[PDB]
Nucleic acid binder design. Structure first.
Ligand SMILES: Nc1ccn([C@H]2C[C@H](O)[C@@H](COP(=O)(O)NP(=O)(O)OP(=O)(O)O)O2)c(=O)n1
Ligand SMILES: [Mg+2]
Ligand SMILES: [Mg+2]
Ligand code: NA
Ligand code: NA
Length: 326
DNA sequence: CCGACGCGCATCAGC
DNA sequence: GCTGATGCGT
DNA sequence: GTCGG
């Protein structure tokens, strides 16, 4: 973190554009700039030096010059003193409350944690759980706990069907010493791109993890994606562990490599890679990589037999998960 | 300049 | 009920 | 907000 002050500033600006301005491309613009600067191996001396990096333009270079000269940004200082922006930015920190709902709540005079807690009936299910564990979801998960959780999930899954394979992805697979949550990729030979020979494949796993009281809440749940809450068990007289967010994604067995590429991330790495794929005349999702016709219509799925194959198609040198943290 | 910026589940409007 | 748009999230 | 065409 040679440029922590700068990347913090850009992230706060990114969050402003997302939550208050509702300008998603500015949000992405700032986050991209923050990302490229984060991995720049020099302590930045000026905006001109930063402007040389892909993603940093004139407006951000000027902000970096202001920040380096004064240690702050007047634009951010103003935003911080604005009541509406500060209220909206706070509310969106609750999972399930986005920019639209946040602004709506503020209009109705619901703008503090305390307001939320007396108006539970005005929240949808996702939001109510987001409020419930607002404090816990703020906390990061030490990798040591991630390993305990991996152990539980992987063996409970084995107990349901020995042919399930569960892979912990996200920041954990990228080797992070702490994670924001747990991300699990799930496969079963009964579910392929060709057919689904068995119903309830995801359900039965969720069910089992609920039975052993690992999963405690459900934010959303469909045939292929589960979004919920989990908690490690604690020993006698021990204070309980924080409740954690857990995502489970069932992916067709034969499309594992596209799936694990997707779910390993990071989110910005995926955006950059998929954008690059477009420039190279391909499109990538969690299932396949497809060529683009001159028309701009996707073709048939190309053969993929490793994560590296996907990198090869778009003429990228392979990058291990630990080097995908952008 | 200026177009473009990488899919699952919950909810709602419209029919 | 189904279809498509929107919100929110991964 | 930034970039390639
Ligand atoms: N916008 C997004 C958000 C997530 N994802 C994918 C890539 C992520 O690594 C994976 C899990 O999302 P995540 O849990 O929000 N982030 P990730 O695990 O990388 O870091 P943490 O904050 O969880 O430690 O989903 C994506 O492709 N685009
Ligand atoms: Mg994660
Ligand atoms: Mg997650
Ligand atoms: Na630049
Ligand atoms: Na939120």
């Amino acid at each position: 973190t040679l440029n922590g002050g700068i990347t913090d500033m850009l992230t706060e600006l990114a969050n402003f554009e997302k939550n208050v301005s509702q300008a998603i491309h500015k949000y992405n613009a700032y986050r991209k700039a923050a990302s490229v600067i984060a991995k720049y191996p020099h302590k930045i001396k000026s905006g001109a030096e930063a402007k040389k990096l892909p993603g940093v333009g004139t407006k951000i270079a000027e902000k970096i010059d202001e920040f380096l000269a004064t240690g702050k940004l007047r634009k951010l200082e103003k935003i911080r003193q604005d009541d509406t922006s500060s209220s909206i930015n706070f509310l969106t920190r609750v999972s399930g409350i986005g920019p639209s709902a946040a602004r709506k709540f503020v209009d109705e005079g619901i703008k503090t944690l305390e307001d939320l807690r007396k108006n539970e009936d005005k929240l949808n299910h996702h939001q109510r759980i987001g409020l419930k564990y607002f404090g816990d979801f703020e906390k990061r998960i030490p990798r040591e706990e991630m390993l305990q959780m991996q152990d539980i999930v992987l063996n409970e899954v084995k107990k349901v069907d020995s042919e399930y394979i569960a892979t912990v992805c996200g920041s954990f697979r990228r080797g992070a010493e702490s994670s924001g949550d747990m991300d699990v990729l799930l496969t079963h030979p009964s579910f392929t791109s060709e057919s689904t020979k068995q119903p309830k494949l995801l359900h039965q796993v969720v069910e089992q993890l609920q039975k052993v009281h690992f999963i405690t809440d459900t934010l959303s749940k469909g045939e292929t994606k589960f979004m919920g809450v989990c908690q490690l068990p604690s020993k006698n007289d021990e204070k309980e562990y924080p409740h954690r967010r857990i995502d489970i994604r069932l992916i067709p067995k034969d499309q594992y490599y596209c799936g694990v590429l997707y779910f390993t991330g990071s989110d910005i790495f995926n955006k950059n890679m998929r954008a690059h794929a477009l420039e190279k005349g391909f499109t990538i999702n969690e299932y396949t990589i497809r060529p683009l016709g001159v028309t701009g219509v996707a073709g048939e799925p190309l053969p993929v037999d490793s994560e590296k194959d996907i990198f090869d198609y778009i003429q990228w040198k392979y990058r291990e998960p630990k080097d995908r943290s952008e």
